[PDB]
Ligand code: FES
Ligand SMILES: [Zn+2]
Ligand SMILES: [Zn+2]
């Protein structure tokens with residue numbers, strides 16, 4: 001299992017454990033965290049986070065393009081971790 005450090009823009013930090021075949025958002029919600037989402041299918045931006053450290057599998061998503069993925073943007077509803085990682089939450093409105 002992997003340690004996912006979730007950091008919010010308001011300064012909260014929580015570490016959520018998540019398996020390599022488990023979605024980041026699902027894991028966070030199990031842990032009781034209040035995370036944004038809408039379609040839960042990788043086709044919008046509502047659940048967006050930014051991967052600051054570590055590695056995530058974004059293969060199931062469809063909304064972000066290749067350059068956005070490279071910058072670290074990640075739709076957490078269908079993202080799965082590939083390492084311990086640090087992810088900034090609540091990022092929809094910062095998507096560029
Ligand atoms: S909630 Fe729509 S892409 Fe994640
Ligand atoms: Zn810390
Ligand atoms: Zn669960």
Ligand SMILES: [Zn+2]
Nearest residue numbers: 045046092093
């Ligand atoms: Zn929105």
Ligand SMILES: [Zn+2]
Nearest residue numbers: 053054085086
């Ligand atoms: Zn580190």
Ligand SMILES: [Zn+2]
Nearest residue numbers: 065066067068
């Ligand atoms: Zn682009």
